[PDB]
């Protein structure tokens, strides 16, 4: 279980301290290693801009480019580190470049594939929804906007969440369905932390915006319905009044408004309740590493906790000397990372779609 | 948000939207078939915008020629919902007039001008009342 950093040319195996991070609430997974060498040796394989591939054991965790390298030495100590992110983090700080700033009738996957072409990032679309693939009647790009900003703006309206794969690709992820692992307070937990704060969760999220009137719809739409648009999503966990009004982000319809309102309600639900645990082993029970987007069964019933299933949201692996092998796994409810079409557990079309939604491994009719 | 660059990254998008709300543009194609004029404008650089509606007051109409300069006012700071409020054609504008004047015009003479001392001049070529 050695952490090998495939840099440009050769392998690097031994390390003094390793820290890797992965999450689905982010578009990259950053790593930081500590290297210790005699003063005067050549450290050029670890330089900013080199193409790195981190490999834990025989499996690749991150791939991309090296960002920073710190070297310090005092009268009684010496410390050298190195850092980096994915190749998907190349989009975060780079400005989106396209010829015609407007896409007339395109879907989110096609927009992303046209935007991530010059860099090298490959886009991956996992959702099998019929409404998440609905094409944009028109989508324009603000000038000097990063690819990350544009794709996040589109994915927020679609309800999809954008993430980075373990091989450097872009991913429009799908939440897990089958409970795979178990975390109990008695057997395999060193430390738990259960925070439950209600300072942000509201009752009724309602979104208001402007209708579509640019061109073809301008010969049909009237004057009042251009300005009068609305969407609502109600929560049953807050029993007081507690409303919220959201100004839309782009041109809006009723169904689009309802989708964003839920998107917001589910994100608030995910951000409210948080579980944190420190397990002893990097590897899982089966043997693979711990990664986000996994549905685990929590049995912290000796501490009077009544949650039964959660979804991992953040995994950070540590190799400090004082720590040993640890991985701090953070947990959030699954119902916070779903698309507005699906729900947590009127015709033949509805029945067939239900069947093919309950069974995702089957091929839809499309 | 502790580092200078981190604060810059956190605060940049708001200023970008503020700076991109109001804008200038040029007019390349005008479509009048729709109930509202649809311009095809050209923004800062290597940026086009097709099907941009133009808004004009009630009771007045005009079809500008290609090449006019428009003031695009984005609604809600989105670079979409772009609406052209004014489309000036500086190449064909009447100049050197009296302090108080008001009148329609066309891109080759054709001035219905109202002049100081109660003069409703109508300079045209073939006036046809109906």
């Amino acid at each position: 279980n050695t952490v090998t950093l495939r840099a440009d040319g050769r392998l690097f195996t031994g390390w003094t301290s390793v820290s890797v991070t992965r999450s689905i609430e982010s578009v990259a997974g950053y790593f930081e290693l500590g290297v210790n060498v005699p003063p005067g040796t050549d450290l050029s394989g670890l330089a900013p801009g080199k193409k790195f591939t981190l490999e834990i054991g025989g499996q690749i965790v991150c791939t991309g480019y090296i960002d920073s390298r710190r070297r310090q030495m005092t009268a009684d100590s010496m410390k050298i580190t190195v850092a980096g992110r994915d190749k998907t983090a190349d989009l975060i700080d780079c400005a989106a470049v396209y010829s015609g700033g407007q896409w007339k009738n395109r879907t989110l996957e096609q927009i992303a594939r046209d935007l991530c072409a010059p860099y090298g990032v490959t886009v991956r679309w996992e959702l099998s929804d019929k409404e998440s693939s609905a094409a944009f009647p028109g989508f324009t790009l603000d000038h000097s906007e990063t690819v990350y900003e544009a794709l996040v703006r589109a994915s927020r309206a679609r309800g999809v969440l954008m993430t980075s794969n373990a091989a450097g690709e872009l991913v429009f992820s799908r939440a897990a369905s089958t409970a795979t692992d178990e975390l109990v307070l008695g057997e395999n937990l060193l430390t738990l932390d259960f925070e439950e704060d209600f300072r942000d969760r509201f009752s009724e999220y309602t979104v208001k915006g402007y209708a579509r009137a640019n061109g073809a719809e301008g010969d049909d739409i009237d004057a009042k319905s251009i300005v009068s648009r609305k969407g609502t999503a109600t929560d049953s966990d807050v029993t007081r009044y507690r409303p919220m009004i959201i100004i839309a982000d782009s041109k809006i319809t009723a169904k689009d408004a309802q989708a964003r309102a839920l998107r917001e309600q589910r994100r608030r639900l995910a951000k409210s309740i948080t579980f944190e645990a420190e397990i002893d082993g990097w590897t899982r029970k089966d043997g693979q590493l711990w990664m986000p987007n996994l549905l685990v069964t929590i049995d912290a019933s000796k501490y009077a906790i009544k949650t039964t299933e959660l979804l991992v949201s953040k995994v950070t692996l540590i190799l400090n000397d004082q720590d040993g092998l640890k991985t701090r796994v953070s947990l959030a409810p699954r119902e916070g990372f779903l698309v507005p079409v699906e729900s947590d557990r009127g015709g033949i079309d509805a029945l067939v779609e239900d069947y093919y939604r309950r069974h995702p491994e089957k091929t839809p009719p499309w | 948000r502790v580092n200078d660059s981190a604060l810059n990254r956190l605060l940049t998008p708001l200023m970008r939207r503020v700076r991109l709300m109001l804008a200038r543009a040029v007019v390349n194609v005008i479509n009048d078939g729709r109930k509202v004029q649809n311009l095809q404008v050209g923004l800062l650089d290597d940026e086009e915008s097709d099907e941009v509606e133009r808004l004009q007051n009630y009771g007045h109409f005009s079809v500008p020629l290609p090449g006019a300069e428009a003031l695009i006012a984005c609604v809600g700071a989105q670079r979409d919902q772009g609406i052209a409020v004014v489309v000036e054609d500086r190449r064909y504008r009447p100049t050197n007039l009296e302090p108080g004047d008001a009148g329609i015009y066309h891109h080759e003479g054709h001035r219905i001008r109202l002049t100081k001392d109660g003069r409703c001049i109508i300079t045209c070529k073939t006036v046809e009342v109906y």
Binding site: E25, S26, Y148, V152 | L10
Partner: peptide
């Protein structure tokens, strides 16, 4: 720097705007 690193990394849930 827990929040100072979440800015340099992506955030599919927008902080502002």
């Amino acid at each position: 720097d827990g929040m100072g690193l979440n800015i340099y990394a992506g955030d599919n849930y927008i902080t502002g705007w």
